[PDB]
């Protein structure tokens, strides 16, 4: 009988893999763009004293286009407790809607499957994927992931493609920072109880709803804790040209008069957006 | 280099530091050219225990 204002919720979002992808804005729901397939070869090293030439072989200019997909839902009430309530259902239930959209958009833009959802770069499977070698222990050939791999992966990016960041679940970073050499010394951050460099300088943006190869942070791997070879660990891509995210209209809320039968006030919300993978040569995937 | 049984060839970091500083000094300044993968084959080298 002494109700507080405390509203402990204890629910989490992800990070946002949105400010990386190239942003483009369209008014209508159907855009189209051009693409240079290949310039082709034009002219050879001909001999001298030859009053002639060769036509070579012309290039190619493809013409692509993509749609924009919509996102809608419905929620309602009873109009009786909403007048007597000790809270505000709408301002909470509305708040519950972008939280569903913001997290659904990000994941679908990552793992979307074809029809009526933008094809994420995971399921596209045209990013080149690099799988790491397994190791030996007491004769067993368990798969592993050493710091030697991480430096090899990030450095193997073609330099002329540009600067590229990296994306990975924080449990991988905790796995990297906690590695140990033969004697017992740490590899990174020798003798300061914590290794935490400024990620922005090492160009490693972090997230939390990637496949997370270390299942619940419980598969470091010596015996039956092996990484279960064939799991995603991290990605790296020049995102400003490897993947685009298009936006048409932000979310909207509109009362639905009709269907509301004087008991059930029924609101309606929706939004339109989309995405598509550009040249999926800038960008590689590390795997176990 | 010798491995368990066979004689597989390899390329160690010590073999590179010995080559670059093996150029006749009285030839002027001399740089070197290499594929990006080769440079990405010297950074990720490990000593006996665990160290880069």
């Amino acid at each position: 009988p002494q109700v507080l204002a405390l509203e402990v919720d204890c629910n989490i979002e992800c990070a946002s893999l949105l400010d990386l992808y190239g942003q483009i804005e369209v008014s209508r729901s159907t855009f189209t763009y051009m693409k240079i397939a290949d310039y082709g070869q034009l002219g050879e090293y001909t001999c001298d004293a030859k009053c002639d030439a060769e036509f070579g072989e012309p290039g190619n200019i493809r013409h692509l286009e993509g749609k924009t997909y919509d996102y809608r839902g419905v929620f309602c009430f009873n109009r009786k407790n909403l007048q007597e309530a000790n809270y505000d259902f709408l301002s909470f239930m509305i708040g519950a809607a972008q939280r569903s959209h913001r997290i659904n958009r990000n994941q679908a833009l990552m793992i979307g499957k074809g029809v009526n959802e933008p094809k994420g770069w995971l399921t596209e499977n045209c990013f080149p994927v690099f799988q790491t070698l397994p190791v030996d222990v007491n004769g067993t050939s368990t798969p592993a992931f050493l710091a030697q791999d991480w430096r090899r992966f990030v450095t193997s990016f073609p330099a002329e493609y540009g600067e590229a960041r990296s994306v990975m679940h924080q449990n991988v970073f905790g796995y990297l920072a906690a590695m140990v050499d033969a004697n017992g010394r740490f590899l990174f951050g020798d003798g300061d109880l914590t290794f935490t460099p400024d990620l922005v300088r090492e160009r490693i943006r972090i997230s939390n709803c990637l496949p997370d190869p270390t299942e619940g942070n419980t598969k470091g791997g010596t015996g039956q804790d092996a990484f279960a070879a064939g799991s995603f660990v991290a990605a790296q891509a020049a995102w400003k040209t490897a993947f685009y995210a298009v936006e048409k209209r932000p979310m909207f809320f509109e009362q639905y008069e009709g269907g509301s039968s004087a008991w059930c006030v029924k609101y309606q919300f929706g939004a339109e957006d989309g995405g598509f993978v550009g040249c999926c040569e800038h960008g590689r995937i590390l795997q176990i | 280099v010798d491995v368990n049984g066979t004689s597989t060839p390899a390329f160690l970091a010590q073999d590179w530091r010995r080559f670059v500083t093996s150029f006749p000094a009285e030839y002027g300044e001399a740089r070197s050219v290499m594929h990006q993968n080769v440079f990405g084959y010297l950074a990720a080298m490990v000593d006996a225990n665990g160290r880069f």
Partner: peptide, 20 residues
């Protein structure tokens, strides 16, 4: 929540010179 383990990477060094 049930007590979950915290298995961390061991002494990982080699991939090609497995001892005799």
């Amino acid at each position: 929540a049930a007590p979950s383990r915290l298995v961390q990477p061991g002494c990982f060094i080699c991939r090609g010179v497995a001892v005799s």
